Nucleic acid binder design. Structure first.
Length: 49
DNA sequence: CGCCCGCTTCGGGGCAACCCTGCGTCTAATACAAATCCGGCAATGGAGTCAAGACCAGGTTCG
């Protein structure tokens, strides 16, 4: 699970303080491409899948 | 009846305060003088050391 892990942070990506609230939610296109369950539950919810 | 002219009202601009869309190897020496380290004898002179050796004073033993 450390492999096959999809993030949105890092270089070339948005910062944590600049993270919009809408990019943390589950779009309905995620069905089959990203898990809507497994994610860190700190101040990183939805930024890492 | 129309007209100027500053007074107020909003716009736009301008500016001040915080993050990363941020985050290269380079002529090459010589010549000389001054300062400084340092290595090694070369005077020590005072401070420690051994040993003899004397100094009685009061237990201790002997008469």
């Amino acid at each position: 699970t450390h492999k096959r892990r999809l993030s949105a942070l890092g270089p070339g990506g948005l910062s944590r303080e600049r993270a919009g609230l809408e990019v943390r939610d589950v779009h309905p296109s995620h069905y089959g491409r990203m898990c809507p369950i497994e994610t860190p539950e700190g101040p990183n919810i939805g930024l890492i899948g």
